Short mmCIF file of N, CA, C and O in Angstrom, two decimals:
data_model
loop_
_atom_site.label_atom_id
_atom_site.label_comp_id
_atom_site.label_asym_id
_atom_site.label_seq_id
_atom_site.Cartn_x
_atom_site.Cartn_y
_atom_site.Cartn_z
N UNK A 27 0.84 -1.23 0.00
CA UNK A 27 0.00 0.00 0.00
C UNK A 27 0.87 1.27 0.00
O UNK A 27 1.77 1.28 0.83
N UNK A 28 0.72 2.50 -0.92
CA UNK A 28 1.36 3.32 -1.11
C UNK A 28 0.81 4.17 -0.45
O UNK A 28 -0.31 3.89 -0.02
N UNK A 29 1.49 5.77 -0.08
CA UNK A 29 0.92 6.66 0.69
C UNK A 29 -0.27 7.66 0.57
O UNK A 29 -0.84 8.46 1.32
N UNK A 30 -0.39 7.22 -0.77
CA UNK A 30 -1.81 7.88 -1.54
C UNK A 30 -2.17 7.08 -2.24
O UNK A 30 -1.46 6.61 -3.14
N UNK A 31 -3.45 6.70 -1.99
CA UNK A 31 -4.16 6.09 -2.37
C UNK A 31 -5.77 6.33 -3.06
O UNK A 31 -6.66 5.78 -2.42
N UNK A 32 -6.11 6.93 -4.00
CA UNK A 32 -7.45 6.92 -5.11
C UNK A 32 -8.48 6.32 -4.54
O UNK A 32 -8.56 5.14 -4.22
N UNK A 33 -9.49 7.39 -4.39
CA UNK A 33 -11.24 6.79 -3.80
C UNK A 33 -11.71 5.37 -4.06
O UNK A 33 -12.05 4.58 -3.19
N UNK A 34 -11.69 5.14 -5.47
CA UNK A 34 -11.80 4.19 -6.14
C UNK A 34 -10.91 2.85 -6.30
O UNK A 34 -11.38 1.78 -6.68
N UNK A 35 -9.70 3.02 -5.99
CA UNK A 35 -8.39 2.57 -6.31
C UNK A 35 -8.98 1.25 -4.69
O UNK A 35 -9.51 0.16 -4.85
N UNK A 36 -8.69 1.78 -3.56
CA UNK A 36 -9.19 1.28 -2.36
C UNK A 36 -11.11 0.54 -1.98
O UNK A 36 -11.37 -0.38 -1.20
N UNK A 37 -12.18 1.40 -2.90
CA UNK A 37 -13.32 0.66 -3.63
C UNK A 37 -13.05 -0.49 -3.87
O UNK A 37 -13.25 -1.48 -3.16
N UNK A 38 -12.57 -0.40 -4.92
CA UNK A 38 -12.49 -1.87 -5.55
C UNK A 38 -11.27 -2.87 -5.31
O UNK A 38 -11.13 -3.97 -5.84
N UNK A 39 -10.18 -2.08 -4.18
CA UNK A 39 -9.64 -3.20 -3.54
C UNK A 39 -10.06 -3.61 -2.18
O UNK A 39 -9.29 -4.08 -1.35
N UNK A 40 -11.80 -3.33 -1.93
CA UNK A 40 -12.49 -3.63 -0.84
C UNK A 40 -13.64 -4.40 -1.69
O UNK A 40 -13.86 -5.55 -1.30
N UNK A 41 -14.10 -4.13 -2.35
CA UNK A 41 -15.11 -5.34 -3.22
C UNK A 41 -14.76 -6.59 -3.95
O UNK A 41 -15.15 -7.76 -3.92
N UNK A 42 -13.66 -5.75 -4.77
CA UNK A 42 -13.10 -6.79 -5.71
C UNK A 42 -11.76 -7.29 -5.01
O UNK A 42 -11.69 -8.42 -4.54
N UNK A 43 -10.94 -6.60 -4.97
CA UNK A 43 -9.61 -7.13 -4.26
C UNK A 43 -9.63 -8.00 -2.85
O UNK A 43 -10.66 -8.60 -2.56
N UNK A 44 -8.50 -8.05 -2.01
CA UNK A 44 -8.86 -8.07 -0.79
C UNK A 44 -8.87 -6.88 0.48
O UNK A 44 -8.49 -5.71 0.50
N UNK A 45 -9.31 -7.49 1.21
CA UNK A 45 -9.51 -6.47 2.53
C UNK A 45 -8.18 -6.33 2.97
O UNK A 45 -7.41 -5.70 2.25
N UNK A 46 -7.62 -6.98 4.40
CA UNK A 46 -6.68 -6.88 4.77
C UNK A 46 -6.27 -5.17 5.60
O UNK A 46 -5.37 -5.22 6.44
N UNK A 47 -6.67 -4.31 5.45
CA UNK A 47 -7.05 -3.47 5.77
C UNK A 47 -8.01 -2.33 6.81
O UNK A 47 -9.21 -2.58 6.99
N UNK A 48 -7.62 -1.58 7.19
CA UNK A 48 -8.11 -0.55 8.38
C UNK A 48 -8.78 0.53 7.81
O UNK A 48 -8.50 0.58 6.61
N UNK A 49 -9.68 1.57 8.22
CA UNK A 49 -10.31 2.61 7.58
C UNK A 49 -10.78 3.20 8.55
O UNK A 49 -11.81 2.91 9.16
N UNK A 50 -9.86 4.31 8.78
CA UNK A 50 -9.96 5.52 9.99
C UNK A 50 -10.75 6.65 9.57
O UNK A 50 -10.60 7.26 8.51
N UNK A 51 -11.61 6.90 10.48
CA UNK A 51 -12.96 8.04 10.31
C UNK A 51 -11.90 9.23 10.82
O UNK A 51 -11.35 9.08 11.91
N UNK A 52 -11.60 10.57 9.90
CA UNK A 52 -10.42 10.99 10.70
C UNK A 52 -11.18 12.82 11.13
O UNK A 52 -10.90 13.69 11.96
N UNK A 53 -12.40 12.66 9.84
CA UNK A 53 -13.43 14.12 9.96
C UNK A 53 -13.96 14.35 10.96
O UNK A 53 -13.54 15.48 11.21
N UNK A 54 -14.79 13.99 11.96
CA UNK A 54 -15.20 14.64 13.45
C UNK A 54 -15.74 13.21 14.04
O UNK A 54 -15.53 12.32 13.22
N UNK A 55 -16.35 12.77 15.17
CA UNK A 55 -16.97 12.44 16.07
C UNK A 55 -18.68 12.01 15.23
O UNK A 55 -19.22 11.10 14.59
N UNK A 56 -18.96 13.32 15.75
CA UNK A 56 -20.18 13.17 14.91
C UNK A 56 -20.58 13.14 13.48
O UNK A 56 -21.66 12.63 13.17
N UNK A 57 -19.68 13.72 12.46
CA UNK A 57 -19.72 13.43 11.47
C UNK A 57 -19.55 12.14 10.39
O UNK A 57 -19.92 11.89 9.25
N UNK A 58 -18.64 11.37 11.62
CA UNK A 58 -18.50 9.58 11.33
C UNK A 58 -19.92 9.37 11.13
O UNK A 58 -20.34 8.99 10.04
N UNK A 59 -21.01 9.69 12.51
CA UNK A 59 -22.14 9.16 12.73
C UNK A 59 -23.23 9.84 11.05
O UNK A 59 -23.92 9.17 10.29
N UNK A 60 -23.01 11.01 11.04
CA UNK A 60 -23.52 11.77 10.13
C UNK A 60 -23.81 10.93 8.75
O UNK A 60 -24.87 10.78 8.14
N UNK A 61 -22.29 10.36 8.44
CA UNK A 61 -22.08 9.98 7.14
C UNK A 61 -20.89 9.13 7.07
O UNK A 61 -19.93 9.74 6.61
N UNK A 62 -20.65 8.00 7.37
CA UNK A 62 -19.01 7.15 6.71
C UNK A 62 -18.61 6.25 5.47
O UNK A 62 -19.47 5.77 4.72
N UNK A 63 -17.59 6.11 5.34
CA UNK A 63 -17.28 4.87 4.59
C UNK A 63 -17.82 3.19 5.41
O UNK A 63 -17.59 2.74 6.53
N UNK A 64 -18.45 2.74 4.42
CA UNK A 64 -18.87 1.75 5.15
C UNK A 64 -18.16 0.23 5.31
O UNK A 64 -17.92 -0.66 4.49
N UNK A 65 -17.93 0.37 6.82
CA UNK A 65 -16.86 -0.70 7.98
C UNK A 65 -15.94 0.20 8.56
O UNK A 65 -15.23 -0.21 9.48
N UNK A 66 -15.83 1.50 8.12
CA UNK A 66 -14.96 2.58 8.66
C UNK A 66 -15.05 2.45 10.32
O UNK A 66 -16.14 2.37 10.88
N UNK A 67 -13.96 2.45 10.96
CA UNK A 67 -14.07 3.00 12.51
C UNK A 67 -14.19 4.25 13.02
O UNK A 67 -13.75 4.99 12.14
N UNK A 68 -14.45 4.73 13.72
CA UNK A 68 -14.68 5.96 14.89
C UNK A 68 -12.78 6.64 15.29
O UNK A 68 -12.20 6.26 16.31
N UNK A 69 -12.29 7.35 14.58
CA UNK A 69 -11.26 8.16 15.08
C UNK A 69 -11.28 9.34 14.70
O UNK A 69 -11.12 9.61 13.51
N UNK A 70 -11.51 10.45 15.81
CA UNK A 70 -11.08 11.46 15.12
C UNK A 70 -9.63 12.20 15.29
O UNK A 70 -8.73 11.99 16.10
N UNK A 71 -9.76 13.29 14.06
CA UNK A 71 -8.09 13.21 13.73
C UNK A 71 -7.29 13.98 14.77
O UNK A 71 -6.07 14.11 14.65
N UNK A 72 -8.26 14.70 16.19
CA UNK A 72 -7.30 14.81 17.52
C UNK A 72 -7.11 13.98 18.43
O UNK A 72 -6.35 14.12 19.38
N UNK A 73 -8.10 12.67 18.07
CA UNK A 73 -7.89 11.50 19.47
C UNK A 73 -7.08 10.40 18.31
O UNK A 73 -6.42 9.56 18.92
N UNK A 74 -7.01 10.27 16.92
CA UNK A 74 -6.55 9.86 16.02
C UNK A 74 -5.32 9.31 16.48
O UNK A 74 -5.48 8.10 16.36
N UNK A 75 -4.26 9.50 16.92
CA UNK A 75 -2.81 9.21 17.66
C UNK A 75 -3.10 8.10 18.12
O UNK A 75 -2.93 6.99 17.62
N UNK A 76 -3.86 8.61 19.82
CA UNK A 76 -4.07 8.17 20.75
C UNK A 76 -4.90 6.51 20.60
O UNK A 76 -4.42 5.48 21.08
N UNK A 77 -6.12 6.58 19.86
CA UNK A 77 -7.01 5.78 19.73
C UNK A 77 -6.08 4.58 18.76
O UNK A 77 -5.75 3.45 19.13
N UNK A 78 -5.84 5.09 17.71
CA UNK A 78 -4.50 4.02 16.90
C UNK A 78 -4.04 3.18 17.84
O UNK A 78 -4.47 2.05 18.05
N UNK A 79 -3.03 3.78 18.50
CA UNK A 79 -1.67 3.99 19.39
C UNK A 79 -2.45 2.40 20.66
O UNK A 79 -2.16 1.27 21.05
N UNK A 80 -3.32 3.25 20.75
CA UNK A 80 -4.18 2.24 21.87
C UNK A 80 -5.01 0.59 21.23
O UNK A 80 -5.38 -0.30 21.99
N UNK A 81 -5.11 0.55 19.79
CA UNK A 81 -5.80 -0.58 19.65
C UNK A 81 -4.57 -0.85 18.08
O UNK A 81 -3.64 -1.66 18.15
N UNK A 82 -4.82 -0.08 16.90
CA UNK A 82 -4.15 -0.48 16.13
C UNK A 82 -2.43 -0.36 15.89
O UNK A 82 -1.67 0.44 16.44
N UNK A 83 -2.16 -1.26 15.05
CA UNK A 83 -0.25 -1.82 15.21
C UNK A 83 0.41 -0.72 13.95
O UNK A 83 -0.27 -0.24 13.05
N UNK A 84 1.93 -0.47 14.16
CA UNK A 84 2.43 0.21 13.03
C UNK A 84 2.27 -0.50 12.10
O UNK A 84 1.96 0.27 11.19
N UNK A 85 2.29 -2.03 11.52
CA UNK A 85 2.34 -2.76 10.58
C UNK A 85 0.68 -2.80 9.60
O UNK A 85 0.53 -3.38 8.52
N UNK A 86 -0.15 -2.19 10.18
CA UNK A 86 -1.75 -2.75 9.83
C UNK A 86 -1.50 -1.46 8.79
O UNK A 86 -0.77 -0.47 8.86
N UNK A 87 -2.55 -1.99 7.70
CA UNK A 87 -2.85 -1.75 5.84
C UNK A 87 -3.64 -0.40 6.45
O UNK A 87 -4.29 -0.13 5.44
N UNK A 88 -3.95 0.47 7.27
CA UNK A 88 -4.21 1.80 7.57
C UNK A 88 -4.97 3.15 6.42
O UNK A 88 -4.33 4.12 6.02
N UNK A 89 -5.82 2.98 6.21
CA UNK A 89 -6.51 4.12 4.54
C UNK A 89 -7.57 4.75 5.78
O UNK A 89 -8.44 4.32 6.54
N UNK A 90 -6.91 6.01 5.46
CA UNK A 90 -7.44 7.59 6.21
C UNK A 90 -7.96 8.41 5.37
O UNK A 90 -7.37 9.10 4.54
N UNK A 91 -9.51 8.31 5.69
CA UNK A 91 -10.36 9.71 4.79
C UNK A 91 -10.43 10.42 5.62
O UNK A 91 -10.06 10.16 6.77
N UNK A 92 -10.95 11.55 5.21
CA UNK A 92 -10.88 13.54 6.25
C UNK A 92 -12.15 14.03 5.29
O UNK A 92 -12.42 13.45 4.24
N UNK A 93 -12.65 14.82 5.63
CA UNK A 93 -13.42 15.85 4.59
C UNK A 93 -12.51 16.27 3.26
O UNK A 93 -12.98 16.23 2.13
N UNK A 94 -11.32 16.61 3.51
CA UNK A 94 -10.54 17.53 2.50
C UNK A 94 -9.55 16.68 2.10
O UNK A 94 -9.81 15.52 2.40
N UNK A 95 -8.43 16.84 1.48
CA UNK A 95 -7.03 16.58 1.40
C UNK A 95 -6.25 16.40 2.25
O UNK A 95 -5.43 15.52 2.54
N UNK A 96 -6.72 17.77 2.80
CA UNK A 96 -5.79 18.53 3.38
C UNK A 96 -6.07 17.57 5.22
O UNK A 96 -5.01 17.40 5.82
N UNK A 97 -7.09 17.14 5.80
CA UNK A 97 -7.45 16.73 7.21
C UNK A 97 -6.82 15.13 6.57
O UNK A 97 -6.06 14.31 7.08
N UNK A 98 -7.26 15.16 5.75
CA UNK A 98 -6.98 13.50 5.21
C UNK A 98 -5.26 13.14 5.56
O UNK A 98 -4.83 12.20 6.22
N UNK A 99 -4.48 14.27 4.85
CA UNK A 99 -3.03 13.52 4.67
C UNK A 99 -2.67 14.06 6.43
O UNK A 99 -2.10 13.28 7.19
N UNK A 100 -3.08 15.36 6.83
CA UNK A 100 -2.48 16.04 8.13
C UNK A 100 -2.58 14.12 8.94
O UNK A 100 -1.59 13.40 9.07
N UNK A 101 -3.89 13.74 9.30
CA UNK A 101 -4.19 12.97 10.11
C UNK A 101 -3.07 11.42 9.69
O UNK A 101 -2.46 10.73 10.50
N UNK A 102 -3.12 11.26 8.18
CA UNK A 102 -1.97 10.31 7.90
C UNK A 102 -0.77 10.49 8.66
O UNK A 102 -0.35 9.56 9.36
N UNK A 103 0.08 12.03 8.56
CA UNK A 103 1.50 12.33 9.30
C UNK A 103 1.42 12.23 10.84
O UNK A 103 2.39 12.03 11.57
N UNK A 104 -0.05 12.41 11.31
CA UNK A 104 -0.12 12.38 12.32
C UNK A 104 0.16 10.75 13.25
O UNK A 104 0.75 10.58 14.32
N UNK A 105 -0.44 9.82 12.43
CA UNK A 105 0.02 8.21 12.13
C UNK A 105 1.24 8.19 11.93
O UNK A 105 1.72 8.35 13.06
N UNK A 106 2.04 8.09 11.23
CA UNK A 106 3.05 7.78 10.70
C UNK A 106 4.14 8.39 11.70
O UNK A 106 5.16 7.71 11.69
N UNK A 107 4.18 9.30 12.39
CA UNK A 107 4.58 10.48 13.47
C UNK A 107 4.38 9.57 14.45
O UNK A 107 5.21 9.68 15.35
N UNK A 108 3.47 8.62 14.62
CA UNK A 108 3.56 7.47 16.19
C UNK A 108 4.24 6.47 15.84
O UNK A 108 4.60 5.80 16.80
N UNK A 109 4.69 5.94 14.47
CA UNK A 109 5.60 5.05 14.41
C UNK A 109 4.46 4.14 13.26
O UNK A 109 4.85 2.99 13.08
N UNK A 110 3.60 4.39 12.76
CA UNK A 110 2.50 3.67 12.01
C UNK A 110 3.31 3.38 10.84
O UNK A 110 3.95 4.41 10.61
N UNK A 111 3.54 2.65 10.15
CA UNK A 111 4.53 2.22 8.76
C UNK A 111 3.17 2.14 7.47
O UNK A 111 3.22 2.66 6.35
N UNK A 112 2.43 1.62 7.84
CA UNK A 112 1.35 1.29 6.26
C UNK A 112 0.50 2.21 6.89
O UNK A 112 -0.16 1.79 7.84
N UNK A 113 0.38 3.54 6.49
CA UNK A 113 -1.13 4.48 6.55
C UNK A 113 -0.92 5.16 5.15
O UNK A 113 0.19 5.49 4.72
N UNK A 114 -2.02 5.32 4.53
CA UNK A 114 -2.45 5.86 3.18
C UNK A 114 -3.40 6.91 3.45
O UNK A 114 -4.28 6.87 4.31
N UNK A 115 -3.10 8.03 2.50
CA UNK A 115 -4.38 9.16 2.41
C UNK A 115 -5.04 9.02 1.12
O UNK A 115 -4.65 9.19 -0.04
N UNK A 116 -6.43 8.57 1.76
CA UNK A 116 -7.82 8.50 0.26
C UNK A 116 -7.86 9.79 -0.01
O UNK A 116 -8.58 10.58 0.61
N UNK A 117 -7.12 10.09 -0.92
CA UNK A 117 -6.72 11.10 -2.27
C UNK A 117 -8.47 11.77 -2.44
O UNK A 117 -9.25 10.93 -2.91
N UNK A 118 -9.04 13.05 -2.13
CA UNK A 118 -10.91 13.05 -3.00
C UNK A 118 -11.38 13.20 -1.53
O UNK A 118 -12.13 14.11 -1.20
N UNK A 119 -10.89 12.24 -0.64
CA UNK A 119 -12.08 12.30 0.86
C UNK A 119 -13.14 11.26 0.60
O UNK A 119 -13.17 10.44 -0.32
N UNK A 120 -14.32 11.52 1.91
CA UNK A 120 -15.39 11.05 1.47
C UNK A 120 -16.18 11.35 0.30
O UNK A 120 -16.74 10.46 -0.34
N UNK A 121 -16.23 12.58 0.00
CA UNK A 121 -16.86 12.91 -0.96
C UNK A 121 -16.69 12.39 -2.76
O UNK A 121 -17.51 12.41 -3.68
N UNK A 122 -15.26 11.94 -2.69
CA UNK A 122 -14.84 11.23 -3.65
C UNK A 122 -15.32 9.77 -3.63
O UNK A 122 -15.56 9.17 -4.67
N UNK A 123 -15.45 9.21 -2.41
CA UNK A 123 -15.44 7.78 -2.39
C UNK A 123 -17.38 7.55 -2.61
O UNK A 123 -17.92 6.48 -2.89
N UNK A 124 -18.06 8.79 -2.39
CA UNK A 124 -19.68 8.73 -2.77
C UNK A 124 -19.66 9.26 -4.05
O UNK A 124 -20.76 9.12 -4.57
N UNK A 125 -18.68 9.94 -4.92
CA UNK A 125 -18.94 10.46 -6.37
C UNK A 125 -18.63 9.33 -7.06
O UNK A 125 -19.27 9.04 -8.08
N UNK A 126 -17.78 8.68 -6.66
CA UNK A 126 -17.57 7.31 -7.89
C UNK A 126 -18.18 6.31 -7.04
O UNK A 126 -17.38 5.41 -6.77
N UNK A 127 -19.61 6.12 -6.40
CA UNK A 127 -20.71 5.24 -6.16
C UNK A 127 -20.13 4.12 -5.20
O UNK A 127 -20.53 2.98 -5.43
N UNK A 128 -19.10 4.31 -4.00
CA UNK A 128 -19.07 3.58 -3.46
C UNK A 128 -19.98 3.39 -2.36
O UNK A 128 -21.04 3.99 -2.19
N UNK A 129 -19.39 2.38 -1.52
CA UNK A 129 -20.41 1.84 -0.43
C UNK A 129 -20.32 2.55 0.98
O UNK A 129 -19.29 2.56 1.65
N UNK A 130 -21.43 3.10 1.32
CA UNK A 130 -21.41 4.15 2.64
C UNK A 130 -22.44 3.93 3.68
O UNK A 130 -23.40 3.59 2.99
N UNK A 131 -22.76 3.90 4.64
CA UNK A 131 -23.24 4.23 5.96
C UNK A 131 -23.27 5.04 6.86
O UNK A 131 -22.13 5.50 6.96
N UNK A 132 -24.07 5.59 7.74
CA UNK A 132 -24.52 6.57 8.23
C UNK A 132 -25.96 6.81 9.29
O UNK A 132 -26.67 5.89 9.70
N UNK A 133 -26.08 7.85 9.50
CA UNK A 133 -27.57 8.23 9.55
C UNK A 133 -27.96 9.08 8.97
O UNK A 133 -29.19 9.01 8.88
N UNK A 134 -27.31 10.41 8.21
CA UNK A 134 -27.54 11.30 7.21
C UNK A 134 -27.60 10.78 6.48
O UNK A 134 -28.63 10.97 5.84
N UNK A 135 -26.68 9.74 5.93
CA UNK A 135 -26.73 9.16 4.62
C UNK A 135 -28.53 7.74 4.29
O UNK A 135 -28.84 7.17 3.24
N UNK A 136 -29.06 7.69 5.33
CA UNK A 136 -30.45 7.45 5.53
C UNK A 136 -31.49 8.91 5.30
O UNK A 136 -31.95 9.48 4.31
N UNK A 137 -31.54 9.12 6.75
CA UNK A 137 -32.39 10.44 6.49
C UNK A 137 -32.00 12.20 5.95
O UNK A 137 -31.22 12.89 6.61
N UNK A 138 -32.42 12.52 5.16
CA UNK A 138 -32.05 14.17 4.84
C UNK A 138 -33.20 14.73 4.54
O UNK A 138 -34.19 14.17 4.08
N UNK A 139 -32.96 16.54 4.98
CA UNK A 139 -33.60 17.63 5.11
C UNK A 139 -34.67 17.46 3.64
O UNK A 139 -34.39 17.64 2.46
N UNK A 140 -35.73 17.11 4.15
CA UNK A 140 -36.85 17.06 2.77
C UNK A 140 -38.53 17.20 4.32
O UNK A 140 -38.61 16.99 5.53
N UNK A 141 -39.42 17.60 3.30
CA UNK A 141 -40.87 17.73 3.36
C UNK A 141 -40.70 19.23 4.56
O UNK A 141 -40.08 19.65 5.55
N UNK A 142 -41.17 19.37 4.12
CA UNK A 142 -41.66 21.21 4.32
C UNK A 142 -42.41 22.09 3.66
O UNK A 142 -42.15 22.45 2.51
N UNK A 143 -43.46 22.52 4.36
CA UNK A 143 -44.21 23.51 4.09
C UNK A 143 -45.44 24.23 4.26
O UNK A 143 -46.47 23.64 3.93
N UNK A 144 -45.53 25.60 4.78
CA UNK A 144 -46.37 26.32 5.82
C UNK A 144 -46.94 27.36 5.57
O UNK A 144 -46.35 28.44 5.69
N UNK A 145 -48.13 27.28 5.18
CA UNK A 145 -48.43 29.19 4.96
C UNK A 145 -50.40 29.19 5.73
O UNK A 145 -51.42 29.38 5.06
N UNK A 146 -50.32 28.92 7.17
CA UNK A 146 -51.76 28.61 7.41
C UNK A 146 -51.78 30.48 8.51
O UNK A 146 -51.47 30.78 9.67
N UNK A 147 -52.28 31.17 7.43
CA UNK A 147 -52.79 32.77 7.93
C UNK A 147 -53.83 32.92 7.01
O UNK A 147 -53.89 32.59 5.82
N UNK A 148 -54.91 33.64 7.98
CA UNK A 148 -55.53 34.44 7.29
C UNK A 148 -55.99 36.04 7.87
O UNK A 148 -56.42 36.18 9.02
N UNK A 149 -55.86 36.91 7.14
CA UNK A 149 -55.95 38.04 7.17
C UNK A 149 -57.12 38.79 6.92
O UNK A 149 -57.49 38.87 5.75
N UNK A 150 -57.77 39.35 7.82
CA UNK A 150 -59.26 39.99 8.05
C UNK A 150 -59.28 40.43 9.07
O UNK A 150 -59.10 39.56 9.93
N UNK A 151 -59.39 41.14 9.37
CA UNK A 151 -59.77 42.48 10.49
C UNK A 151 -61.21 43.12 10.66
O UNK A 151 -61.72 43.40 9.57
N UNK A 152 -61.88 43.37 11.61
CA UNK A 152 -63.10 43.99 12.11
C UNK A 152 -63.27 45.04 12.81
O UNK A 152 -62.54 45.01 13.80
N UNK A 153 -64.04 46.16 12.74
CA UNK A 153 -63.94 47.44 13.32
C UNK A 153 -64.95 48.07 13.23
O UNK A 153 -64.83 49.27 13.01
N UNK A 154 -66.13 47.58 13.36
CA UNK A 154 -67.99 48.09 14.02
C UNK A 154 -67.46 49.44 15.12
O UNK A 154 -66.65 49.66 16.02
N UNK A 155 -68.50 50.11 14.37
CA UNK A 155 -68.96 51.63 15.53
C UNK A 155 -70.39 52.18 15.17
O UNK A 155 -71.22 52.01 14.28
N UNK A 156 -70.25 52.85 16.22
CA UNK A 156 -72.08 53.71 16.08
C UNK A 156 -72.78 53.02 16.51
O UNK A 156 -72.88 52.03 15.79
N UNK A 157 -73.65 52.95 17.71
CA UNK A 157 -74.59 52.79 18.49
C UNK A 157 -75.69 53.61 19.37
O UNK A 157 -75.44 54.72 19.84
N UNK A 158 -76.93 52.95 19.54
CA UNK A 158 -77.79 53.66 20.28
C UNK A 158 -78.21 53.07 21.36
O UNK A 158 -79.00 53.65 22.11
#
């Protein structure tokens, strides 16, 4: 496994290829829950070290998505910086790995912002005078 690694490239060496492999949630806490790669684990990229460090080995096949590039590779150096030898940055993010139709899980990725809509007013006014 090389240090960059293609949305797709890692796809289809999870469907078609073999597994063998780790897949670190590295974008937030709740955003794992929001939306992940699906079999992805729970790390985010400030407990990211720590949580590794504590369950996974420098030797394990390691592929780190982020929102950006940029959270993606930081959180890789941040691995590799504890002594991690095989960690890869998914090149695109999540957002790459849902544009070329891979496989995802979630609860956003279930439910999203749909059915709305409100307009119950009505407007009429009353104002009687003059009496005997």
């Amino acid at each position: 496994m090389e240090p960059q690694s293609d949305a797709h490239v890692l796809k289809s060496r999870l469907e078609w290829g073999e597994p063998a492999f780790t897949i670190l949630d590295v974008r937030d806490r709740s955003t794992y829950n929001d939306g992940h790669i699906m079999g992805a684990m729970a790390m985010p990229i400030e407990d990211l070290v720590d949580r590794a460090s504590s369950s996974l080995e420098k030797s394990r096949d390691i592929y780190v998505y982020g929102a950006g590039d940029e959270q993606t590779s930081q959180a890789v150096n941040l691995l590799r910086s504890a002594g991690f030898e095989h960690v890869s940055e998914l090149k695109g993010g999540l957002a790459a790995w849902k544009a070329i139709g891979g496989p995802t899980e979630g609860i956003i990725e279930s439910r999203t912002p749909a059915g709305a809509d409100d307009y119950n007013v009505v407007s009429r006014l009353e104002h009687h005078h003059h009496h005997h």
